[PDB]
Symmetry: C2
Subunit: 283 residues, 2 copies
Amino acid sequence: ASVEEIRSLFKQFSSLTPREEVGKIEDITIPGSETNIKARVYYPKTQGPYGVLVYYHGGGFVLGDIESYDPLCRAITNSCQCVTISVDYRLAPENKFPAAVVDSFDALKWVYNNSEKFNGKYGIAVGGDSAGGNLAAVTAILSKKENIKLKYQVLIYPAVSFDLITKSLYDNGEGFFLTREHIDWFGQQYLRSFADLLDFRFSPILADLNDLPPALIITAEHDPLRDQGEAYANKLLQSGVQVTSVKFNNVIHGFVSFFPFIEQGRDAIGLIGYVLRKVFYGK
Amino acid sequence: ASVEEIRSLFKQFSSLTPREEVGKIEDITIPGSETNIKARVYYPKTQGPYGVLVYYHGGGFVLGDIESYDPLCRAITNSCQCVTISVDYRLAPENKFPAAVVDSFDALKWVYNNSEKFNGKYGIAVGGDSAGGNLAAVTAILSKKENIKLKYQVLIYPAVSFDLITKSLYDNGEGFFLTREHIDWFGQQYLRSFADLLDFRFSPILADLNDLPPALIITAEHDPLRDQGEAYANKLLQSGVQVTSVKFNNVIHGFVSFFPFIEQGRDAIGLIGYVLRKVFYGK
């Protein structure tokens, strides 16, 4: 299948997944430094003021979009009882690294600077799954540098490093949905050159992680990315940041997207909701 | 320290913990088959009807009690928004196996038969930590035998088998609070003879686990009991029971007890809260 055909398939498959009712939805355009960035704003059914979660979909920097991730964002919104803003960052191979990063940070900054539009008085968090988790993590690093004070970061089986060595990569690199071959191909679509492997904006493990927001990092047992996700948690802890690092057993990469039929996914969404309600509201 | 001093040391240190407000608290005495069993009933701040969680404290079958667990049970009550009933089962060595089991099951049957007294229309779950997780699991197995239909079981780093073989026992058997020497000593206090090692009421991994209530099983990375907790999850899964099995990284056996200081414990309490709100209330 072509890239376009797979992008379309993501949207089609999403229409089989129930979309929970939320309080209100609005589609907005965020004025980026390089592009006008579409985003979808979900309000919860409770009354404000709110926290705001800026969410970055996964898809290997190539696939996914606001629509295919609409069911998941609705579910997160109801779980966190918080405004969720799902960001349509530019994709590769049309838009190489660091386009996705530039859009993700620009959106965060604009949300942070415009939070009153959303009655977002309880502050701003970032979160994302897989490649989206990568973008959340990188956006939190970039925020530190600009004195943007985030509340939290929710990293759902994030990609944090180029990896040829972890035991989970070899144990789990075939037979469990996301394969070695996929990982290679996504990296080829996204990166410009081998030198980008030295860039913390691609591998955030490289960065100094002092003074970042407290994190919930979810990994999955049968996931080639498992060990590097746990490494990121450990390096955050070593750098004095509070992190809850949880491995969900018996499930594969992507399981949170399959919450309607993988119950552990629903429970991960419950846990995500709890930590954000705690950090935003005190509970 | 005698058994008495070791008990009093745990009470003392628990006595200094802020207790979360709950709705209301009632102490009751349940007419057991072998003894009168004190239980503390915690109501959430919401109104009913409720689900009911019957909770069994940890402490290696030798320590702990309603008072020393009172802060944890309050925190759980508020998290699950459910009536929580903390059971004062008989302790060893004064009362050998299977005294704890008899009391734990006797309490459960009585609660199940008297659920209207608590406005407990949404059904009954069991839960517990460590030795108490053992008791919860064994209670669910005994309940199945007598056609008592439970909604859920929450097993927090449960003891499920006599163990001389797991990797986690050897990796984590010293230096992480719960040591080989403690495991040995608790078993010596609790059991009557080596024959008791064959009894599923001490090692619930021995039982047929078909048709048991869906489970949340939490394990801790640096815990000698980690692998056998995961084995219980996997054996339940093999037996067609839905289970969410989650390993909390970077923490030790007992971490949920330390929730005021160890933030991962607070987050574990959030997850327990979510799964029970889900199964009782659809929330």
